[PDB]
Each structure stands twice: as structure tokens, then as C-alpha cells.
RNA sequence: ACGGAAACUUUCGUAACUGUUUAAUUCUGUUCACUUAUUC
């Protein structure tokens, strides 16, 4: 499998509320875009039977600035791995920056566990604008933008085949998150040849102090042993559904999954949960497959 | 089958009303058109 490289600028990626926005984005945001364009193109009965093929998976948002970036491990270092806090004045001034850290570089994935505390590089500044609506007198909303600079890209790793190359190629001329009606979500698809020789520790078999990402959800069956002696971080993601027959826009059920970079100790399974409020002619399904890293 | 769908910071209104580039001011102070000469 290969990987896709794309960048964003002057876009919008909300989180929780329409007026609020963040830098990265969840993993289920990409999967919800390929299904919408499959019915419009003419292959709805072909993309549904491809995502549930086990070997086909997706990733979350990862920055790309002169090298790939990886999230920090949750829980590391522990109380014994970290150095002894002899002087509390010199430890509290550097331990707070590790909690607010976003992502780590590709050359610091092996030295962070031995003792390395530094400030993360600033990706982009948060910019916001304002609009209104004349001929109404009674509407004033606030929206934000994600204007990236200093060469900031958000690559994605998927399973390259003879059908995926024709699906995500037309996505750059559309939108992905934020105000799509204005033109927030366009990117530039860039393909290469030989992937990175360093980030090749992705497997789904053994479980020897691994770490699952992509903000996946564990299976409903095995959970007592997988969650035991582990860590996670609950998030928040909800919203209305996409349909054309219903005239009420029902609110979908929330799916408080985990976060990226959560360490565990047992191989998960990764199933497909069905979320249906009342009734819909289509089918709302969740993806987010876990990906383990050897660390 | 996307915290996404739906949206003009819009209409508004001479940078304007009075004001001599002028007040003071001899293109003139000195200056033979001439030295020499029988209309017989
Ligand atoms: N009066 C108090 N008694 C006990 N604990 C306190 C009191 N005031 C604050 N704290 C503790 O201090 C913590 C907040 O620390 P704070 O964020 O102010 O550190 P900081 O000033 O940012 O550190 P630095 O200056 O190194 O950045 C809280 O978790 C709280 O438990």
C-alpha cells in the first residue's frame, strides 16, 4: 500500500460547534466524503463492499512539514521512566509543555522515551472573519479559517488499488469540512513512488506494548481485557445526517470514541456499528479502523 | 451518506463654507551730426 500527500490552506475544520474550529480533523471525516460521492458518480453498490475488506484501512490527520509527524504517546513517560524531580521549580516549567504538545517529529520517536522535552513547532495561526445577512436584520454569525503557511501538509495513508485512485482524485475539486459552500476543503493530490522507509511498523497481529491510533472504537465483545491496563481519551463528535427523503433532519447518536496515540496491550478487532435514529432509506455506518505501531 | 446543510458587513453621503501673488517703483546719469571752403 502507498500513501497520498495533500495540503490545505485558507480552509475550515470545525470541532463540536460550527463557530469553533481546530487545526487537525478526525478520521471519520474522510470516510464520510467518499461515500457521498459514490452515489453521485454511480458506484454505491461497489464502495460499500470494499471498505469492509479488513486489509483496507484509513488514517487520521498527520501534519507534514519536511517530514512526517507522529502523535505523542499517552501516559509516557511514567513515574519511574522520567527523571526524579529534584528541583520542583525546574521540572514544572518544562513538564507543562509536554501536556500541550500536538505532534512529534519523525526523528524524535526513539529519543522521546529516554528523556526529551522541547516546544513543538507552531504550524499556523488561528484566523477568523465575520459576515452577516442584509435584507433580514437579525443574523450575525462568526466563522474561523485555517490558513496554513510555512509549507504545511496533511498526508494520508490508505490502500492503493485500481479504484481508489479514481475516487479521491475528484475530491480536491470539492470540499472537506467547514463552509463547503464557499470553498473550504480543497487540496492538491500528490502521488510519489517509494514510501517512507521509517514509518513501516504498522501491523495487525501481535500486541507487545503497541499503540493504536486513528481514534478507533474497540469491539463490543472483547473489552474487559483490552481496556484493562491501558489508557484512552474520550472526545466529542456528532451532527445531523445526510438524506434526501426525510424532511426533519434527525440528530444522530453520539459516538464518544478514543483519541489518537492511545496505548493499549491487546489486539483489537474493529467492527462496524450501526447508528440509526428513527428511519432513513440509506444506512449510516462508522469506520475508523485501528492501526497498531511497534514503537 | 461530513459540526456539516441554509448567509453581500450591506443601504446611507461633493474633504466643504469665506479669500486681488501683492504693497513700495521716471530704461536713464554725461552728449553741437562735424574740422577745412571767394557760383565765378
Ligand atoms: N492555593 C492553592 N493550594 C493548593 N494548590 C494550588 C493552589 N493554587 C493553585 N494550586 C495548584 O496549581 C495548579 C495550577 O498551576 P498553574 O497552571 O498556575 O502553574 P503555572 O503558573 O502555569 O506554572 P508555570 O509558571 O511554570 O507555567 C492547579 O492544579 C492547582 O492544583
Numbering used by the authors: 3 to 297
What does the literature reporting this entry say, word for word?
In a CRISPR-Cas system, Cas proteins form a complex with a small CRISPR RNA (crRNA) to detect and cleave invading nucleic acid (DNA or RNA) that has a complementary sequence to the crRNA. The Csm complex, with the RNA cleavage site located in Csm3 subunits, targets and cleaves ssRNA at 6-nucleotide intervals. In this study, we determined the cryo-EM structures of the Csm complex from Streptococcus thermophilus, with or without target ssRNA, at 3.3–3.5 Å. The results showed that the Csm complex displays a spiral-like architecture, with two spirally stacked density columns, including a single Cas10, a single Csm4, and multiple copies of Csm2 and Csm3.
It should be mentioned that the D33 residues in Csm3 subunits of the target ssRNA-bound state were mutated (D33A) to eliminate ssRNA cleavage. The cryo-EM micrographs and 2D class averages of both complexes display clearly a worm-like shape with mixed particle sizes. These heterogeneous particle images were classified computationally into two particle populations each yielding three-dimensional (3-D) reconstructions for the apo state (big [3.4 Å], and small [3.3 Å]) and for the target ssRNA-bound state (big [3.4 Å], and small [3.5 Å]). In total, the big maps contain 7 repeating Csm3 and 5 repeating Csm2 subunits, while the small maps contain 5 copies of Csm3 and 3 copies of Csm2. The target ssRNA is slightly less resolved but still well enough for us to trace the backbone connectivity of the core region with an apparent base-pairing to the crRNA. The heteroduplex of crRNA and target ssRNA show a repeating base pairing pattern along the spiral configurations of Csm3 and Csm2 subunits. The pattern consists of 5 base pairs, followed by a base pair disrupted by the thumb of a Csm3 or Csm4 protein. Therefore, the Csm3 or Csm4 thumb intercalates within the crRNA-ssRNA duplex at 6-nucleotide intervals. Our structure clearly shows that the DNase active site in Cas10 is located on the opposite side from the last modeled 3’-base of the ssRNA. Although the model of the 3’ flanking sequence of the ssRNA cannot be built due to its high flexibility, lowering the threshold reveals a possible locality of the 3’ flanking sequence in the map of the target ssRNA-bound state, which does not occur in the map of the apo state. Since these bases are far away from the DNase active site, the influence of the ssRNA binding to the Csm complex must be accomplished through an allosteric mechanism.
